[PDB]
Design a protein around this ligand. Structure first.
Ligand SMILES: [Mg+2]
Ligand SMILES: [Zn+2]
Ligand SMILES: [Zn+2]
Ligand SMILES: [Zn+2]
Length: 89
DNA sequence: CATTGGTCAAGCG
DNA sequence: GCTTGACCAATG
């Protein structure tokens, strides 16, 4: 009744924090505006990209790079999952 | 186990 | 008002 402004247009959920509504709505629309520059990860929320970026390497620690596509990883097992997904040959 | 999407709201000035 | 990151349950 005016608070519709703070309400999700797809499921009727009411928010007090308008930014929570913006992010929630993307779970309906599929919009993923935050794009990793180091892989094809994309997400609905700025801080998820920040969290994701930590999987590409930390400052003081060592980094494992895919020999084929040059992608960097902080965790070797995550590189091997990448190897099997993207370089099956 | 590492990593994720959806959620929540403390804290900032 | 908004950014931020912790929480939780889920995935592989
Ligand atoms: Mg953050
Ligand atoms: Zn909704
Ligand atoms: Zn990435
Ligand atoms: Zn690669």
């Amino acid at each position: 009744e005016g608070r519709r402004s703070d309400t999700c247009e797809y499921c009727g959920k009411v928010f007090k924090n308008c930014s929570n509504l913006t992010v929630h709505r993307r779970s309906h629309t599929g919009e993923r505006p935050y794009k990793c520059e180091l892989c094809n990860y994309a997400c609905a929320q700025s801080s998820k990209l920040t969290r994701h970026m930590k999987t590409h390497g930390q400052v003081g620690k060592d980094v494992y790079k895919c020999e084929i596509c040059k992608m960097p990883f902080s965790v070797y097992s995550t590189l091997e999952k990448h190897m099997k997904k993207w370089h099956s040959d």
